[PDB]
Amino acid sequence: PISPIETVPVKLKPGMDGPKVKQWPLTEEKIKALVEICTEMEKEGKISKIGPENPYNTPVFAIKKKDSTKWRKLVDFRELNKRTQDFWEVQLGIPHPAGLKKKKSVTVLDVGDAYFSVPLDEDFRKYTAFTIPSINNETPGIRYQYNVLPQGWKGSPAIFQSSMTKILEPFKKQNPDIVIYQYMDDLYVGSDLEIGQHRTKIEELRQHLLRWGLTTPDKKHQKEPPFLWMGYELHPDKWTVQPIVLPEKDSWTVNDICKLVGKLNWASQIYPGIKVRQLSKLLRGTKALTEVIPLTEEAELELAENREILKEPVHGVYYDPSKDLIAEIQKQGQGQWTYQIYQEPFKNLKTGKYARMRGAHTNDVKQLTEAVQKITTESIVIWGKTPKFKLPIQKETWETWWTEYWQATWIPEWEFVNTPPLVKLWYQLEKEPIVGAETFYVDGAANRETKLGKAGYVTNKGRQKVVPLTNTTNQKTELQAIYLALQDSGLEVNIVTDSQYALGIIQAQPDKSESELVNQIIEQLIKKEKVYLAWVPAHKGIGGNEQVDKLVSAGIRK
Amino acid sequence: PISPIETVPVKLKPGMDGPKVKQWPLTEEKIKALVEICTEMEKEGKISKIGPENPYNTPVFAIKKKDSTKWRKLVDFRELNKRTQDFWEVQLGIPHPAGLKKKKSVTVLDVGDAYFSVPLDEDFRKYTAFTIPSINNETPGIRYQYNVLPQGWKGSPAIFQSSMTKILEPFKKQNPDIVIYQYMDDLYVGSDLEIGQHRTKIEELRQHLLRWGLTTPDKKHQKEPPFLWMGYELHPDKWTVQPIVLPEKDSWTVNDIQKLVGKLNWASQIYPGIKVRQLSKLLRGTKALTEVIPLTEEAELELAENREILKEPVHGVYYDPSKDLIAEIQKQGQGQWTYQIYQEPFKNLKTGKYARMRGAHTNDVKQLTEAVQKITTESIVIWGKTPKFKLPIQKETWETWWTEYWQATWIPEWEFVNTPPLVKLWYQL
Amino acid sequence: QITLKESGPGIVQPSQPFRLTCTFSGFSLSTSGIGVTWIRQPSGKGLEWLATIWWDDDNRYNPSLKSRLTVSKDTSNNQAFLNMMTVETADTAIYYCAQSAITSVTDSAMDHWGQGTSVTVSSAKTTPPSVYPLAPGSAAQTNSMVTLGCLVKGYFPEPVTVTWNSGSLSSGVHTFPAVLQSDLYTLSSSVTVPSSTWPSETVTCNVAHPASSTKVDKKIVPADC
Amino acid sequence: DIQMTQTTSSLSASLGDRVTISCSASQDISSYLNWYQQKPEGTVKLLIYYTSSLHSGVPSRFSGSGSGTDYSLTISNLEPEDIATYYCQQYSKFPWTFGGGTKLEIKRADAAPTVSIFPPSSEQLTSGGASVVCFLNNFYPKDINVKWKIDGSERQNGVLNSWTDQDSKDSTYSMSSTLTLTKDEYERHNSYTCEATHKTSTSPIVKSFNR
DNA sequence: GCATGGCGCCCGAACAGGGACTG
DNA sequence: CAGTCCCTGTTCGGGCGCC
Ligand SMILES: [Mg+2]
Incomplete structure (x- = not known):
C-alpha cells in the first residue's frame, strides 16, 4: 500500500542536472534475476516504467545473500546524491x-x-531513472523510475x-x-x-x-x-545495554583497535568509570589502517581494568521528575574524569567520562569547570533540567580560583564531596614582591634565519648565566630564561620578563601542559615556596632590562 | 493573509547563501513556552510549518522577561541579519x-x-526557517518559517x-x-x-x-x-567617562616604579604627551625590587605632570558611522567591570565602568552578560549601533549560560579572548 | 503643601457599615509611585495597618480583615475611601489615612499622615451625664491643701468639657480619661486648692456635653457630718 | 504577618540625654524598616525610612540603624519634644507591620500618691446608686497599684480605674479609681478603704471612712 | 562496483587571528 | 609599516562505535 501523504518537493543542487551514468553489462543470471524483483516492484507500484525521452540513468547491479541464496537489487545512487539538494536534517541526537x-x-x-511506502515527489522521479540491461546487444534494457523513497538516496x-x-x-x-x-x-x-x-x-x-x-x-x-x-x-x-562482545583477537592492528575503543565508549554510558585514553594513543600519529601494532602494557592495563568492569553486568534506572538530578564528578588518570548522574543514593541514571583537554597549558580547576559545563548540557538534552553537582574540590579552592582569574567563570549549585584524589591548585604566585629573595631579570631571543639564540638572567647582586639554545624561537627562549631563574635560585625569588606570552601562560596557574619546558617550569613553581613575577616593556630601556637584553642580543640581525 | 500592502523584495549580499546554523539544546521550561507561543503563531498564520526540504535554519530560544513576567520567543537572526545589509544600513537606514x-x-x-502585520517577501522566506528541540530527542524537530516581517531581523x-x-x-x-x-x-x-x-x-x-x-x-x-x-x-x-589615573604612593619601591612605567608607557599610545625617560632613569641598574627609591625633583616633576594629561578627552576623536563598533570588557574584580568602545585601536570613543546590580549573585557569567547588555544599550542610544564584543570568557562557558541571564529583544555579535592583566591600564583603586 | 483629612461618621451602630473619606491635595493618585494607606489605632493600643490603595489599583489588604474591608478612590476629586462592613465594638478606634509613596528602588514610606477620624461602635443612645460633687468627710479639713472632686457618670458619647469655677481655677486640676460602664461613659476630675480658700470661696464643677446640648454646674458643698 | 517587636515599652530619660530604641523582626527584612514619631497630641510623623535615611525636615540629632533582624533608633541629645511614642514599620512584605511602640518619657525624682477617698454624694444615692471615688495624684513613677477593702474584706466588683498621661509640666501621674455598688449595698456596710501601694512606702498609703 | 542520515569518540590537518620580529 | 613567523584556538576531515 502507498501513502495518501502529500509529497515533499525536492530540487537538484542549484544549476546542476540529473545523473546520466552508464550501466555495466551483467550476467543472464543476474539480469533475469533483477527482472524478477524489478517486476514485482513494478506491480507493487514501487516503481514505474519510463519513456525514452528520459535521458537520466544511474547504475544498478544485483547481489545474493549467502544465506537463502536469494537476490537483491542494489542501486548505486552515488551520483544522484551528489546532485540532490541538501536537506536540513531533522533527526538531532x-x-x-x-x-x-x-x-x-x-x-x-x-x-x-x-x-518503499512514502511517495517520491512526482517532479523528481525522472532522476531516479535506471536501466536493467538486456541479456545481449539486443534492444536497450528495461527502463524504470522510482515512485517511492528510493533506499540509498540522500533525501530519503x-x-x-x-x-x-x-x-x-x-x-x-x-x-x-x-x-x-x-x-x-x-x-x-x-x-x-x-x-x-x-x-x-x-x-x-x-x-x-x-x-x-x-x-x-x-x-x-x-x-x-x-x-x-x-x-x-x-x-x-530498569534497563540494560545490549551485551557488548568486544573483539579479543590475538593479532592487533590499528583498525581492530577502533572497533574496541569505540565500543568501550559505547559502554562508558552505563559502566561506571572506563579508561580508554590508555590504548587510545595506540592510534596516535600519522598511521595506516591495516598496519599491525604492538599492545603496550600501559595500554594492556586499560584492557585489564576495562574487561574487568564489563565482566560484572549492571543496570541503569528510569527518570523521576520530582526528584531533582545529581551529577558526581571523579578525578582519574591525567586528563580523564568520570561522572554518575543519579537521583537516589546509588541508582545510576547514566554514567560517563570526560577526557578532552582544551588547549595546551591547562590545569585542574579548568578541566573540572569544563567537565561540569559538558555534563550540564548533556543533561539539558536528556532531561531538559540542569543537575545539582557533587565535586572533588573544596569551596575554598574554588572561591580563590575565580576571584583571582581575569577570565570570568562560574559553576552552578553544588556541594563538596570529600573523596580524593581531590582537586586543588598546586602552586600560587605572590601578589607583592617578596623580600629576602634575589630579583632575577630574565630574558632571551633568537633569529628566525638561524633557528638559534641565547637566554639568561642578571640578578641584582651581579650573578649571571646565558645558556645557548638551538632550534627555538623568542617565545621559546624568553620562556626559557624564566626556567633558569627557577633552578638557579632559592625557595623564594622575584622574576622579570618582557614577554606577556610567557607571563600569561604562568599566571594562569598552569598545572599541566603539552610542552615539557613549561611542564618543568610548572615543576619548579610547585617545588619552591614563594614566587612573584613582574613585567616590563622590553626595548624601552627600563631598569634591569637593558642588562640581560644586551647580554642576549648577541645575534640580533642578519 | 494579514495585509494588502505590497511586499518589498530582499536579496542577501551577493555570493552568500542563507543561514545554516544549528539548534542548541533548550531546557523544558523554554521549550514548553516556545511551543505554545509558536502554535498560536501558526494558527493566526504569521508562521508556517515546513519540512526537511528547506536547507536553511536559525536558532531560537525564549526568555521569561522579568520586565513583564511574560515569555518572549527569541530568534538569533544574527547570521541572516549579516547576510542581508545593503537593505537596512544603506538603502533604508x-x-x-x-x-x-x-x-x-x-x-x-x-x-x-x-x-506581525506586514507580509514578508515571497521568496525571502526560506531564509527565516527555524526549529524546535525535543527533550531527550523524543521526536524530530518541529520546523517553521516566517510569512510576515520577523522579530529581530534588521530588515523588519x-x-x-x-x-x-x-x-x-x-x-x-x-x-x-x-x-x-x-x-x-x-x-x-x-x-x-x-x-x-x-x-x-x-x-x-x-x-x-x-x-x-x-x-x-x-x-x-x-x-x-x-x-x-x-x-x-x-x-x-549617570553616564560618566572613566579616565585612567596613576597611583599615589608616599615612598615608591622599585617594583612600584616599573608598574607606573608600564602604564605610563601603554597610555602613551592613547595620549602621546606621556614621557617616561626622566622618570624611568630612577631605575638604571640591576637592583632588587623591594628597594625604596627617592623620587627625583626631575622625576616627581613629570609624574604629577603626566597625570595632568590623564583627565581630558583624547587627541581629537571622531566617530565614523560608516565603521563598525568594538567594545572590550575586563573583569576588574569584586563585581566591578570596565569597558571601552572604540572604532579604531587606541582611539577609544568611550570608557566606563559598569559597577554592579545587587542581583549579581556572585556570578561573573550573569554579571558579564548584564554588562554586555548594559553596554550595548548605551551604544544604541549614543551612536545608534551595536558594537562587536571581545568577551573576557571561555566560549564553552559563555555558550552554556549566557541565555539564562539574558533579557533583550536583540543580540550583539561577540568573540572570545584570553588576554591576561596586561597592566592595570583601566584603573582599579 | 501636601495634606490629607479623614472624614467619617465617627459613631456607628454595631453590625453596620461605615465609609471613611481621605480628601487630600498636594499630589495626585495618578503619579507613578503614589498611593494612600489606611492606618488604624484603637483607644490606647498601638498602630495597625488596614490597607493601601495604589495608583495602579493593585490594592493590598490586612489579611485579618480583607473580608470586611474595601478600598477605592476618585482620582479626579483627590479623595480616597475605605469601607468597612459589619463593624464591631473592637473596630472603635481612630483611623488615619496617610500619603504613601514609593520613592526609589529601596524607599517606600508613609511620608505624610492625616489627623485621623474617631470612629466608635456603640448601640448606645446619646444621653447626657448626671453630675455629682466630691467633698471630704470624717477627715473634715486641714490647715493645708484640700482636694475637691467632681463625678460625671453615664453619658454618651464622648467627649465632655469640664472646668473649675468657669475657668477661674486651673492649676491643681486633674480631669481623668473616661471609661465604659454598661456601654456608657463615666469620668471624674479632681481639683486641689489650699484650705484657706474652700469653703470660704465657692468652688463649682463645670460640665459640658455637646452632643446632648447640656451644660451643668455643681457646687462643692462641704461634708455635713 | 512578620511580627515586629519592640521589647522596650516605657522608657524614661532626661533632656540632653541620648537614647536608642530596639525594633526586632521575625525574619531578615533587608533594611526595609521605617521609624514613626507619635506625639502625645496624636499626630504621626516620619523620622526615618530605609532603616537609616532621614526624612526631609527632621533634626539631624536623629539616626537609626540595624540589619537583618535587629534594628535600632537613636535620638542624639534629647530636646523637650522628642519625649514621645515611637513606632517602627516593616515594609519588606505585606501585610505591613509596626512595633508595639516605645513611649519615651521624662525622669523625675520619685514622689508619693497624694490619696483622697470620697463618699457617695447624696444626689447619687438619691437616685439609687453609690460610687466611691479615690484620687491618687501626682505620683512617680507610673507603676502604682490600688486595693479596695470593705470592712476589711477585699472587693473586686465595681472597681474601675483610669490612668492619666505624664503631665508635661511636673512629669507625674494621677489615677482615679471608682467603686460602684448599689445603694442598698452601700447601706449594707460601713467601712470602705482605698490602699495605694507605691514604690515609695513599704506600707500601703491608706485613706478611708465610715458612713 | 557497495547505503542514506543522525549522535558519540579519538586523531591530525587546514585555517584564522593576534602579537612580535625584520628591513 | 609591510612582509613573515610563532602560537593558540577552532573547524573540519577520517575511522570506529550506536541507531
Ligand atoms: Mg626580549
Missing part, C-alpha cells in the same frame, strides 16, 4: 532510556517497507521522517497522555493505562498508520519485556 | 537622534508585534519604518520635546520631564500606539521591596 519515565504499559513497533531519510511525523500529529493531540518515542521507522509507545485500555489504544494507532500506508507488521513487542529499543533492553523497573 | 543621549529619562518599548524595522514614521507623526507634533528612536524590536523614548511625568507621557504613548493596533508589552511594578521597576527608565547622565 538519539534518544536515551535515562530520559524515559516509568510507565504502566509499554509497546514497541516497527513499520514495514518504511521507505529526512523525508520519510517528516512523513511519519506529520502522520502521527493527529493521533498525538488526540491522546496527549501517551508518549510516542519515534526514531526513524521505529516507535516506542507507552502510557499509564491498564493493559486493556492501552492495547485498545495501540490498536487504534496501528489502524491509523495502516490507513495511512504505514504497515505495522507482527514484529512488534507486546507484553514482551525486555523491549529491544535503540540498542538497549527495557525492563519495567 | 533609520537616522539617529543626536539628542536622544541628551535626555534625562528614556524608556524602551518592545514594539515587536507591530511587525526598515521595512516597517514607513508605517512607523506615520504612527508617530501625531504624537511627535503634539509633544515636540520628546524624542523617539527605533532600533529593531525597540522604541527608545526619552523625555526631560520629571520622572513622574515621563512615566506618564510614556504610558500615554502606549495608548496612541494601541489606538493603532501596535500592542506593547505590559510591564509589572511590584509593591514588595526591591522596586526593580524603578530602573525601567534610563538616564543618560
Whole structure:
C-alpha cells in the first residue's frame, strides 16, 4: 500500500542536472534475476516504467545473500546524491532510556517497507531513472523510475521522517497522555493505562498508520519485556545495554583497535568509570589502517581494568521528575574524569567520562569547570533540567580560583564531596614582591634565519648565566630564561620578563601542559615556596632590562 | 493573509547563501513556552510549518522577561541579519537622534508585534526557517518559517519604518520635546520631564500606539521591596567617562616604579604627551625590587605632570558611522567591570565602568552578560549601533549560560579572548 | 503643601457599615509611585495597618480583615475611601489615612499622615451625664491643701468639657480619661486648692456635653457630718 | 504577618540625654524598616525610612540603624519634644507591620500618691446608686497599684480605674479609681478603704471612712 | 562496483587571528 | 609599516562505535 501523504518537493543542487551514468553489462543470471524483483516492484507500484525521452540513468547491479541464496537489487545512487539538494536534517541526537519515565504499559513497533511506502515527489522521479540491461546487444534494457523513497538516496531519510511525523500529529493531540518515542521507522509507545485500555489504544494507532500506508507488521513487542529499543533492553523497573562482545583477537592492528575503543565508549554510558585514553594513543600519529601494532602494557592495563568492569553486568534506572538530578564528578588518570548522574543514593541514571583537554597549558580547576559545563548540557538534552553537582574540590579552592582569574567563570549549585584524589591548585604566585629573595631579570631571543639564540638572567647582586639554545624561537627562549631563574635560585625569588606570552601562560596557574619546558617550569613553581613575577616593556630601556637584553642580543640581525 | 500592502523584495549580499546554523539544546521550561507561543503563531498564520526540504535554519530560544513576567520567543537572526545589509544600513537606514543621549529619562518599548502585520517577501522566506528541540530527542524537530516581517531581523524595522514614521507623526507634533528612536524590536523614548511625568507621557504613548493596533508589552511594578521597576527608565547622565589615573604612593619601591612605567608607557599610545625617560632613569641598574627609591625633583616633576594629561578627552576623536563598533570588557574584580568602545585601536570613543546590580549573585557569567547588555544599550542610544564584543570568557562557558541571564529583544555579535592583566591600564583603586 | 483629612461618621451602630473619606491635595493618585494607606489605632493600643490603595489599583489588604474591608478612590476629586462592613465594638478606634509613596528602588514610606477620624461602635443612645460633687468627710479639713472632686457618670458619647469655677481655677486640676460602664461613659476630675480658700470661696464643677446640648454646674458643698 | 517587636515599652530619660530604641523582626527584612514619631497630641510623623535615611525636615540629632533582624533608633541629645511614642514599620512584605511602640518619657525624682477617698454624694444615692471615688495624684513613677477593702474584706466588683498621661509640666501621674455598688449595698456596710501601694512606702498609703 | 542520515569518540590537518620580529 | 613567523584556538576531515 502507498501513502495518501502529500509529497515533499525536492530540487537538484542549484544549476546542476540529473545523473546520466552508464550501466555495466551483467550476467543472464543476474539480469533475469533483477527482472524478477524489478517486476514485482513494478506491480507493487514501487516503481514505474519510463519513456525514452528520459535521458537520466544511474547504475544498478544485483547481489545474493549467502544465506537463502536469494537476490537483491542494489542501486548505486552515488551520483544522484551528489546532485540532490541538501536537506536540513531533522533527526538531532538519539534518544536515551535515562530520559524515559516509568510507565504502566509499554509497546514497541516497527513499520514495514518504511521507505518503499512514502511517495517520491512526482517532479523528481525522472532522476531516479535506471536501466536493467538486456541479456545481449539486443534492444536497450528495461527502463524504470522510482515512485517511492528510493533506499540509498540522500533525501530519503529526512523525508520519510517528516512523513511519519506529520502522520502521527493527529493521533498525538488526540491522546496527549501517551508518549510516542519515534526514531526513524521505529516507535516506542507507552502510557499509564491498564493493559486493556492501552492495547485498545495501540490498536487504534496501528489502524491509523495502516490507513495511512504505514504497515505495522507482527514484529512488534507486546507484553514482551525486555523491549529491544535503540540498542538497549527495557525492563519495567530498569534497563540494560545490549551485551557488548568486544573483539579479543590475538593479532592487533590499528583498525581492530577502533572497533574496541569505540565500543568501550559505547559502554562508558552505563559502566561506571572506563579508561580508554590508555590504548587510545595506540592510534596516535600519522598511521595506516591495516598496519599491525604492538599492545603496550600501559595500554594492556586499560584492557585489564576495562574487561574487568564489563565482566560484572549492571543496570541503569528510569527518570523521576520530582526528584531533582545529581551529577558526581571523579578525578582519574591525567586528563580523564568520570561522572554518575543519579537521583537516589546509588541508582545510576547514566554514567560517563570526560577526557578532552582544551588547549595546551591547562590545569585542574579548568578541566573540572569544563567537565561540569559538558555534563550540564548533556543533561539539558536528556532531561531538559540542569543537575545539582557533587565535586572533588573544596569551596575554598574554588572561591580563590575565580576571584583571582581575569577570565570570568562560574559553576552552578553544588556541594563538596570529600573523596580524593581531590582537586586543588598546586602552586600560587605572590601578589607583592617578596623580600629576602634575589630579583632575577630574565630574558632571551633568537633569529628566525638561524633557528638559534641565547637566554639568561642578571640578578641584582651581579650573578649571571646565558645558556645557548638551538632550534627555538623568542617565545621559546624568553620562556626559557624564566626556567633558569627557577633552578638557579632559592625557595623564594622575584622574576622579570618582557614577554606577556610567557607571563600569561604562568599566571594562569598552569598545572599541566603539552610542552615539557613549561611542564618543568610548572615543576619548579610547585617545588619552591614563594614566587612573584613582574613585567616590563622590553626595548624601552627600563631598569634591569637593558642588562640581560644586551647580554642576549648577541645575534640580533642578519 | 494579514495585509494588502505590497511586499518589498530582499536579496542577501551577493555570493552568500542563507543561514545554516544549528539548534542548541533548550531546557523544558523554554521549550514548553516556545511551543505554545509558536502554535498560536501558526494558527493566526504569521508562521508556517515546513519540512526537511528547506536547507536553511536559525536558532531560537525564549526568555521569561522579568520586565513583564511574560515569555518572549527569541530568534538569533544574527547570521541572516549579516547576510542581508545593503537593505537596512544603506538603502533604508533609520537616522539617529543626536539628542536622544541628551535626555534625562528614556524608556524602551518592545514594539515587536507591530511587525506581525506586514507580509514578508515571497521568496525571502526560506531564509527565516527555524526549529524546535525535543527533550531527550523524543521526536524530530518541529520546523517553521516566517510569512510576515520577523522579530529581530534588521530588515523588519526598515521595512516597517514607513508605517512607523506615520504612527508617530501625531504624537511627535503634539509633544515636540520628546524624542523617539527605533532600533529593531525597540522604541527608545526619552523625555526631560520629571520622572513622574515621563512615566506618564510614556504610558500615554502606549495608548496612541494601541489606538493603532501596535500592542506593547505590559510591564509589572511590584509593591514588595526591591522596586526593580524603578530602573525601567534610563538616564543618560549617570553616564560618566572613566579616565585612567596613576597611583599615589608616599615612598615608591622599585617594583612600584616599573608598574607606573608600564602604564605610563601603554597610555602613551592613547595620549602621546606621556614621557617616561626622566622618570624611568630612577631605575638604571640591576637592583632588587623591594628597594625604596627617592623620587627625583626631575622625576616627581613629570609624574604629577603626566597625570595632568590623564583627565581630558583624547587627541581629537571622531566617530565614523560608516565603521563598525568594538567594545572590550575586563573583569576588574569584586563585581566591578570596565569597558571601552572604540572604532579604531587606541582611539577609544568611550570608557566606563559598569559597577554592579545587587542581583549579581556572585556570578561573573550573569554579571558579564548584564554588562554586555548594559553596554550595548548605551551604544544604541549614543551612536545608534551595536558594537562587536571581545568577551573576557571561555566560549564553552559563555555558550552554556549566557541565555539564562539574558533579557533583550536583540543580540550583539561577540568573540572570545584570553588576554591576561596586561597592566592595570583601566584603573582599579 | 501636601495634606490629607479623614472624614467619617465617627459613631456607628454595631453590625453596620461605615465609609471613611481621605480628601487630600498636594499630589495626585495618578503619579507613578503614589498611593494612600489606611492606618488604624484603637483607644490606647498601638498602630495597625488596614490597607493601601495604589495608583495602579493593585490594592493590598490586612489579611485579618480583607473580608470586611474595601478600598477605592476618585482620582479626579483627590479623595480616597475605605469601607468597612459589619463593624464591631473592637473596630472603635481612630483611623488615619496617610500619603504613601514609593520613592526609589529601596524607599517606600508613609511620608505624610492625616489627623485621623474617631470612629466608635456603640448601640448606645446619646444621653447626657448626671453630675455629682466630691467633698471630704470624717477627715473634715486641714490647715493645708484640700482636694475637691467632681463625678460625671453615664453619658454618651464622648467627649465632655469640664472646668473649675468657669475657668477661674486651673492649676491643681486633674480631669481623668473616661471609661465604659454598661456601654456608657463615666469620668471624674479632681481639683486641689489650699484650705484657706474652700469653703470660704465657692468652688463649682463645670460640665459640658455637646452632643446632648447640656451644660451643668455643681457646687462643692462641704461634708455635713 | 512578620511580627515586629519592640521589647522596650516605657522608657524614661532626661533632656540632653541620648537614647536608642530596639525594633526586632521575625525574619531578615533587608533594611526595609521605617521609624514613626507619635506625639502625645496624636499626630504621626516620619523620622526615618530605609532603616537609616532621614526624612526631609527632621533634626539631624536623629539616626537609626540595624540589619537583618535587629534594628535600632537613636535620638542624639534629647530636646523637650522628642519625649514621645515611637513606632517602627516593616515594609519588606505585606501585610505591613509596626512595633508595639516605645513611649519615651521624662525622669523625675520619685514622689508619693497624694490619696483622697470620697463618699457617695447624696444626689447619687438619691437616685439609687453609690460610687466611691479615690484620687491618687501626682505620683512617680507610673507603676502604682490600688486595693479596695470593705470592712476589711477585699472587693473586686465595681472597681474601675483610669490612668492619666505624664503631665508635661511636673512629669507625674494621677489615677482615679471608682467603686460602684448599689445603694442598698452601700447601706449594707460601713467601712470602705482605698490602699495605694507605691514604690515609695513599704506600707500601703491608706485613706478611708465610715458612713 | 557497495547505503542514506543522525549522535558519540579519538586523531591530525587546514585555517584564522593576534602579537612580535625584520628591513 | 609591510612582509613573515610563532602560537593558540577552532573547524573540519577520517575511522570506529550506536541507531
Ligand atoms: Mg626580549
